[PDB]
């Protein structure tokens, strides 16, 4: 999943941060899952990975 959370850095400043949830897997017996809140889409992707 991808999603959008607002991140308030100050009473004026507001950023749009997105939220990623994914899971890495290999059918060979090894998986893992991650999530992250980052500024960009690519960012939350790499982060969560």
């Amino acid at each position: 999943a991808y999603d959008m959370r607002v991140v308030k850095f100050s009473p004026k400043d507001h950023r749009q941060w997105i939220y990623c949830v994914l899971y890495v897997g290999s059918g060979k017996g090894i998986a893992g899952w991650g999530r992250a809140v980052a500024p960009s889409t690519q960012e939350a992707k790499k982060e969560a990975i």
């Binding site: 959370r5 607002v6 991140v7 308030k8 850095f9 100050s10 941060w17 939220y19 999530r35 992250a36 809140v37 980052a38 500024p39 960012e43 982060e47």
Partner: protein, 35 residues
């Protein structure tokens, strides 16, 4: 590495599910704050 384990590139690293939903908390508290 070069810095702390509980702080990543963008701010505090968000362990509980409260931080994924409310990620202001990751970077903000008070007036005195730096990265």
């Amino acid at each position: 590495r070069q810095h702390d384990s509980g702080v990543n590139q963008y701010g505090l690293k968000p362990t509980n599910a409260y931080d994924y939903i409310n990620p202001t908390n990751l970077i903000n508290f008070g007036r005195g704050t730096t990265f």
